[PDB]
Write a protein that holds these residues in place. Sequence first.
Motif, PDB file in Angstrom:
ATOM      1  N   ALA A   1       0.825  -1.201   0.000  1.00  0.00           N
ATOM      2  CA  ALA A   1       0.000   0.000   0.000  1.00  0.00           C
ATOM      3  C   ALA A   1       0.874   1.272   0.000  1.00  0.00           C
ATOM      4  O   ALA A   1       2.055   1.196   0.373  1.00  0.00           O
ATOM      5  N   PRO A   2       0.425   2.475  -0.428  1.00  0.00           N
ATOM      6  CA  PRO A   2       1.193   3.708  -0.282  1.00  0.00           C
ATOM      7  C   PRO A   2       1.641   3.952   1.157  1.00  0.00           C
ATOM      8  O   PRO A   2       0.922   3.672   2.125  1.00  0.00           O
ATOM      9  N   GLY A   3       2.886   4.426   1.280  1.00  0.00           N
ATOM     10  CA  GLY A   3       3.444   4.733   2.572  1.00  0.00           C
ATOM     11  C   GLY A   3       4.950   4.530   2.570  1.00  0.00           C
ATOM     12  O   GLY A   3       5.607   4.293   1.543  1.00  0.00           O
ATOM     13  N   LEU A   4       5.483   4.693   3.798  1.00  0.00           N
ATOM     14  CA  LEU A   4       6.907   4.535   4.046  1.00  0.00           C
ATOM     15  C   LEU A   4       7.258   3.144   4.569  1.00  0.00           C
ATOM     16  O   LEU A   4       6.570   2.525   5.397  1.00  0.00           O
ATOM     17  N   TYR A   5       8.379   2.640   4.027  1.00  0.00           N
ATOM     18  CA  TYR A   5       8.830   1.281   4.283  1.00  0.00           C
ATOM     19  C   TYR A   5      10.352   1.268   4.441  1.00  0.00           C
ATOM     20  O   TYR A   5      11.046   2.205   4.054  1.00  0.00           O
ATOM     21  N   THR A   6      10.854   0.210   5.070  1.00  0.00           N
ATOM     22  CA  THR A   6      12.307  -0.031   5.063  1.00  0.00           C
ATOM     23  C   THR A   6      12.543  -1.460   4.525  1.00  0.00           C
ATOM     24  O   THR A   6      11.596  -2.186   4.192  1.00  0.00           O
ATOM     25  N   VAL A   7      13.807  -1.889   4.363  1.00  0.00           N
ATOM     26  CA  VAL A   7      14.147  -3.165   3.754  1.00  0.00           C
ATOM     27  C   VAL A   7      14.330  -4.291   4.783  1.00  0.00           C
ATOM     28  O   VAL A   7      15.040  -4.109   5.778  1.00  0.00           O
ATOM     29  N   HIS A   8      13.691  -5.453   4.566  1.00  0.00           N
ATOM     30  CA  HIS A   8      13.824  -6.566   5.504  1.00  0.00           C
ATOM     31  C   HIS A   8      15.137  -7.310   5.270  1.00  0.00           C
ATOM     32  O   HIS A   8      15.625  -7.362   4.143  1.00  0.00           O
ATOM     33  N   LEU A   9      15.700  -7.877   6.333  1.00  0.00           N
ATOM     34  CA  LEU A   9      16.952  -8.641   6.268  1.00  0.00           C
ATOM     35  C   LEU A   9      16.911  -9.788   5.260  1.00  0.00           C
ATOM     36  O   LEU A   9      17.939 -10.139   4.685  1.00  0.00           O
ATOM     37  N   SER A  10      15.739 -10.399   5.052  1.00  0.00           N
ATOM     38  CA  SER A  10      15.561 -11.474   4.075  1.00  0.00           C
ATOM     39  C   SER A  10      15.772 -11.106   2.602  1.00  0.00           C
ATOM     40  O   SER A  10      15.805 -12.003   1.739  1.00  0.00           O
TER      41      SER A  10
ATOM     42  N   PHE B   1      18.586 -10.156   1.479  1.00  0.00           N
ATOM     43  CA  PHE B   1      19.993 -10.357   1.168  1.00  0.00           C
ATOM     44  C   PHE B   1      20.417 -11.823   1.243  1.00  0.00           C
ATOM     45  O   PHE B   1      19.809 -12.648   1.937  1.00  0.00           O
ATOM     46  N   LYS B   2      21.413 -12.187   0.430  1.00  0.00           N
ATOM     47  CA  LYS B   2      21.971 -13.529   0.444  1.00  0.00           C
ATOM     48  C   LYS B   2      23.435 -13.459   0.055  1.00  0.00           C
ATOM     49  O   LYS B   2      23.856 -12.449  -0.522  1.00  0.00           O
ATOM     50  N   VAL B   3      24.245 -14.475   0.425  1.00  0.00           N
ATOM     51  CA  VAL B   3      25.612 -14.517  -0.089  1.00  0.00           C
ATOM     52  C   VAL B   3      25.567 -15.145  -1.483  1.00  0.00           C
ATOM     53  O   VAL B   3      24.958 -16.203  -1.678  1.00  0.00           O
ATOM     54  N   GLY B   4      26.159 -14.452  -2.474  1.00  0.00           N
ATOM     55  CA  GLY B   4      26.211 -14.908  -3.857  1.00  0.00           C
ATOM     56  C   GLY B   4      27.281 -15.952  -4.140  1.00  0.00           C
ATOM     57  O   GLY B   4      28.068 -16.329  -3.279  1.00  0.00           O
ATOM     58  N   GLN B   5      27.339 -16.399  -5.392  1.00  0.00           N
ATOM     59  CA  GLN B   5      28.302 -17.431  -5.770  1.00  0.00           C
ATOM     60  C   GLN B   5      29.744 -16.991  -5.765  1.00  0.00           C
ATOM     61  O   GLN B   5      30.604 -17.864  -5.877  1.00  0.00           O
ATOM     62  N   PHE B   6      30.092 -15.696  -5.600  1.00  0.00           N
ATOM     63  CA  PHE B   6      31.495 -15.299  -5.514  1.00  0.00           C
ATOM     64  C   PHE B   6      31.843 -14.944  -4.063  1.00  0.00           C
ATOM     65  O   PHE B   6      32.930 -14.431  -3.803  1.00  0.00           O
ATOM     66  N   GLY B   7      30.954 -15.232  -3.098  1.00  0.00           N
ATOM     67  CA  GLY B   7      31.171 -14.995  -1.668  1.00  0.00           C
ATOM     68  C   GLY B   7      30.869 -13.578  -1.169  1.00  0.00           C
ATOM     69  O   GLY B   7      31.073 -13.272   0.008  1.00  0.00           O
ATOM     70  N   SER B   8      30.389 -12.676  -2.033  1.00  0.00           N
ATOM     71  CA  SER B   8      30.011 -11.313  -1.635  1.00  0.00           C
ATOM     72  C   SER B   8      28.502 -11.194  -1.431  1.00  0.00           C
ATOM     73  O   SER B   8      27.751 -12.057  -1.857  1.00  0.00           O
ATOM     74  N   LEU B   9      28.032 -10.189  -0.698  1.00  0.00           N
ATOM     75  CA  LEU B   9      26.600 -10.021  -0.440  1.00  0.00           C
ATOM     76  C   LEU B   9      25.893  -9.522  -1.693  1.00  0.00           C
ATOM     77  O   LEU B   9      26.402  -8.698  -2.466  1.00  0.00           O
ATOM     78  N   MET B  10      24.686 -10.034  -1.872  1.00  0.00           N
ATOM     79  CA  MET B  10      23.872  -9.661  -3.020  1.00  0.00           C
ATOM     80  C   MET B  10      22.456  -9.410  -2.555  1.00  0.00           C
ATOM     81  O   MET B  10      22.062  -9.912  -1.513  1.00  0.00           O
ATOM     82  N   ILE B  11      21.676  -8.684  -3.365  1.00  0.00           N
ATOM     83  CA  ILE B  11      20.246  -8.603  -3.068  1.00  0.00           C
ATOM     84  C   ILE B  11      19.595  -9.748  -3.835  1.00  0.00           C
ATOM     85  O   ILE B  11      19.829  -9.929  -5.043  1.00  0.00           O
ATOM     86  N   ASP B  12      18.765 -10.509  -3.126  1.00  0.00           N
ATOM     87  CA  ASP B  12      18.021 -11.568  -3.799  1.00  0.00           C
ATOM     88  C   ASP B  12      16.778 -10.919  -4.390  1.00  0.00           C
ATOM     89  O   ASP B  12      16.622 -10.825  -5.603  1.00  0.00           O
ATOM     90  N   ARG B  13      15.873 -10.501  -3.516  1.00  0.00           N
ATOM     91  CA  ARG B  13      14.701  -9.744  -3.928  1.00  0.00           C
ATOM     92  C   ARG B  13      14.471  -8.696  -2.868  1.00  0.00           C
ATOM     93  O   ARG B  13      14.545  -9.027  -1.696  1.00  0.00           O
ATOM     94  N   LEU B  14      14.170  -7.439  -3.198  1.00  0.00           N
ATOM     95  CA  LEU B  14      13.933  -6.417  -2.180  1.00  0.00           C
ATOM     96  C   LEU B  14      12.576  -6.699  -1.515  1.00  0.00           C
ATOM     97  O   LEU B  14      11.535  -6.675  -2.190  1.00  0.00           O
ATOM     98  N   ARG B  15      12.613  -7.069  -0.238  1.00  0.00           N
ATOM     99  CA  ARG B  15      11.444  -7.399   0.571  1.00  0.00           C
ATOM    100  C   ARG B  15      11.248  -6.251   1.544  1.00  0.00           C
ATOM    101  O   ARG B  15      12.189  -5.810   2.184  1.00  0.00           O
ATOM    102  N   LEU B  16      10.053  -5.675   1.597  1.00  0.00           N
ATOM    103  CA  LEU B  16       9.801  -4.486   2.405  1.00  0.00           C
ATOM    104  C   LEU B  16       8.950  -4.678   3.639  1.00  0.00           C
ATOM    105  O   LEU B  16       8.127  -5.587   3.698  1.00  0.00           O
ATOM    106  N   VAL B  17       9.198  -3.851   4.666  1.00  0.00           N
ATOM    107  CA  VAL B  17       8.378  -3.884   5.879  1.00  0.00           C
ATOM    108  C   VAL B  17       8.023  -2.464   6.295  1.00  0.00           C
ATOM    109  O   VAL B  17       8.823  -1.555   6.077  1.00  0.00           O
TER     110      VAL B  17
END
Lengths: 86, 86
Positions: free
Chosen positions: A57-66, A68-84
């Motif tokens: 819905a319209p409004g203000l949100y921040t990003v949930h910890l879920s 993020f994931k570790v990618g195949q080269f060992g660095s952090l990646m965004i999997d899908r931006l999940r909001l709360v």
Amino acid sequence: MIKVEIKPSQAQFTTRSGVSRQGKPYSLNEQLCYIDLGNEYPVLVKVTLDEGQPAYAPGLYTVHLSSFKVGQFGSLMIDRLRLVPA
Amino acid sequence: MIKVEIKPSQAQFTTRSGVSRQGKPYSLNEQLCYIDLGNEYPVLVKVTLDEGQPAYAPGLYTVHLSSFKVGQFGSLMIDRLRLVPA
């Protein structure tokens, strides 16, 4: 914290469809939002929703910890931006 | 906020080197850290440092907004994980 805003004009999603490599149907729901990345204005970003989830819905949100994931080269990646709600 | 920890054993970086497509030398400094992604224990993640920056000292850190950029498909991506003291 990342500040994300769904504007009144962004309250809907659109759906793309197709067929996987080995025959399965898929559907992806996509919604737009504005994210403040510290430039003069917030920028437009596409969000892909998870299965069975309604549009945010319209409004203000921040990003949930879920988001993020570790990618195949060992660095952090965004999997899908999940909001709360902020 | 993402909680990142540099342990006492992770206080150094290593350097990889090579030559770009058109002849320029490069050097990349890489450091390891632990990030709490909400599982039973924090996970190991590789960080690539920016030019002229020392290794982060042991302690607690969070992620700076400059870590993120909009990618070529219009979704948010991590460019490089940039850290700031918690």
